[PDB]
């Protein structure tokens, strides 16, 4: 499976979105699992989840790696509401467009925020909920904020360069030897191809700062069975937010990988794939 | 499989132990997994692990549920060293007696302390290490000590009664409806059958208090792949000790169950069985 | 200064309260500091704060040790709203009745919850805010709930006895040698004198459980300079709630005493008196 | 009081040190309080503590702001042991040279590590112990390591520039408006004046990495009354290490300032001065 062979577009119509173009990569044909990426410059569905799509499709799922509005090959957008909520409306838009009644959601960082908002706004449309260091859950009890990785994310958005890209990835990943030329050129190309996105993210972050993403107070409403994952060494979203979800969501469990940054699904792909497939099959 | 049909005895000879009688329950014939129980009055191998033995044997393992010295049907003993270390010597004693070169260890609370000490003292003799709220790892950063469950454990040892037994189990378990008459009569019978054990535990705890169990400083020596589990609602050993192990053991991961006390393997048996079998097979 | 010589009553009229009798103990004549007690059976202003009233009056303050509705010699009441809010209305009622424009508030546990609610509802009427292990601030990230001390508080309310009183105080205090016959007889007399209160607290806790006290989401509104204190060894309200306040209140600081339960102002009276007087004078 | 008018030198002879030149700034003539600075490039006694020396001398103390070996105007050195221990030997060297029997110690970051080592090695020679975010106390339960501020400290040591100096100070301080041209030129001058120091620190850090500083296991030996301070927003040493000290030192208390980085004594000078003077006088 490749990016090109799985690539598709659909136009969505939900709330603020009027014939809005969403790019996604799809493979398999069983029950739908939608995977949602983080918010750093150059992020997208395929580059975030290409180590997971095959094992999940092999397990019998239909995998959709979604480009969120204002990322990769989805349409440009300036948001005046918190991104989690706006992203969640796009997921619903996508699901209505494709005649998907219910989906399992997998979400990393911004995508975790998106998945949380989806489960809150559309409880009838979600199956299980897999959350990987979800962003925007308010203050940490230990970590000064903005987090180190968040400052680097904003620096790269404002002053894009290859060197700053590299500095950011060095913070996002625990194992530095995973930072190959392929990884760097990939993200770099995604940044170069659509400069509008970087500009629009910064404008959006002015209208709705990260403090406006906090849906902590509503976590008690989530009835979806929930699997929370964290990287022990995540410098982007703090580890105690894993406890926060575990205490506040009715039916949750927490799995923390050692030697792992913000991309558990990439840095610990085999173990991640096994744990989440097992959870989707048996929890 | 029943307690009687699996029941066996072996005499051990290791360090302080001279023809010391160890009771265990054994089933299956593949690679050996030894399971080690907690330290509360009436504890033993079968009653701690009877929901795990079948699924593990079905997965192809040889399961040994060991009675630790001074518990259940193993010989009475007064210890002058920290119990974790003395227990670990007994495990080695048992393994030498049965011609077992290497074992996977599963350990809850006191049994977690035992498993840690085994991995430190006999690194050549352990496979993987599964730790469920291991006891004795020093102070908590949050929890006042002695913990609520520890005070109840000492109260029941000093003044054994059925009512105090019930109070203790109400603290050990999250879901109170799991406290059946069968569970209570079981522990009660184990207490009544061998009063010597209760007396000896209290004498042992005078010679070597819980503060002497702390092997934190040596955690860097463990090269065994390690799976750490915790109950979110454990009132016996504090949750932050899960983080402590995760930060200090080279190759560890942490899994925390919601709505779960000190017996994860019993309160969340299906998920526990799946996660640990998957880990023994694939990590 | 004694309980009798400082004792006063005032009738309050605020929201739900119609000629409601509030007992308080008053000394000094400078700026008003109102001190507010915890919620355990037998609690009251004088017995909670008699080690603080003198040093504070000597520093030049007018000290009011308030009996909260449904405690000690204040009127009996059954509350259908969270106690923090109802208590805060009584403080305002008291201040209107006595022509006090502004007060510094000192609050322990339930009294901390009361002080928080006062600062939120009547920001124009508060000076500085001193919070000692305030209750009701939602879940802990570490501590299973209900906390050990909370279970003992409810046990004593439902089955009052001298022996259960003693068990509770043994948990509330770090240093057990502070539990004199004077302390025990004091609380015991307060319990015996007004059994209606115990009954009414349990009815009130049914109508508005502790989960309804959580004002976390509004902490950003507090503009009062705030001094947060905690006992390291508090088994009633969890230590991480000190961090929660410190992160969420604009101008806060946190002071944690070692070897200290839920009554810092009593167990570490000299240091407490010095720190809070210094704060009221100079912050 | 100025840097020049208070400036002094003494030659020390203790263990490894043979006629080793130590620079310090001294004022006052009552009981000795020695203040010890952090380890970042350009650090020294006067620039770290010039907001504290006056108020402390006014309170009646003799203040000594010590330059640690390999910093500011003290002699250059390459250390093969952990810096905390080597620094502590220098403090003793200084105290023997000046006929000081006992000193109160105030220590920030590296200076906190120094103060801890002094109290452990020379318990007869210390009065009270004031610790401000002490470095080297092992892993954090929450914070990935090396900490953000530590990476910036090593970057500035290896590639000294004015721009990198500014980036580091922006992380060390919470309030960015405190970063004046005076502050920057000060640190810059200290860096330019002695490049040997920067080189030697990096060599020393190779021989004895930060992991070798961990004296956690010996904290139970400290009988000095101890005042622990932390900045809530410290990105150099993690907040949970404040809890670690509070749990493990016999007689400790913890004070955490909001809106505060690694220099509490500078960022919150008035409150810091009041709290520590009160502690030295009355604890």
Curated annotation (Swiss-Prot), chains A, B, C, D:
Activity regulation behaviour: Inhibited by 3-Cl HOPDA.
Pfam families assigned: Abhydrolase_1
Keywords: Aromatic hydrocarbons catabolism, Hydrolase
Stored Gene3D superfamilies: alpha/beta hydrolase
Entry's EC annotation: 3.7.1.8
Pathway annotation: Xenobiotic degradation; biphenyl degradation; 2-hydroxy-2,4-pentadienoate and benzoate from biphenyl: step 4/4
Annotated signal sequence range: none
GO CC annotations, alphabetized: membrane
Active site: residue positions: 262
Binding site for substrate: 39-40, 48, 108, 177, 187, 263
Catalysed conversion reaction: 2,6-dioxo-6-phenylhexa-3-enoate + H2O = 2-oxopent-4-enoate + benzoate + H(+)
Function field: Catalyzes an unusual C-C bond hydrolysis of 2-hydroxy-6-oxo-6-phenylhexa-2,4-dienoic acid (HOPDA) to produce benzoic acid and 2-hydroxy-2,4-pentadienoic acid (HPD).
Alphabetical list of NCBIfam families matching this protein: biphenyl_bphD
Subunit structure: Homodimer.
Family assignment from sequence similarity: Belongs to the AB hydrolase superfamily. BphD family.
Name of the protein this chain belongs to: 2-hydroxy-6-oxo-6-phenylhexa-2,4-dienoate hydrolase
Gene from which the chain derives: bphD
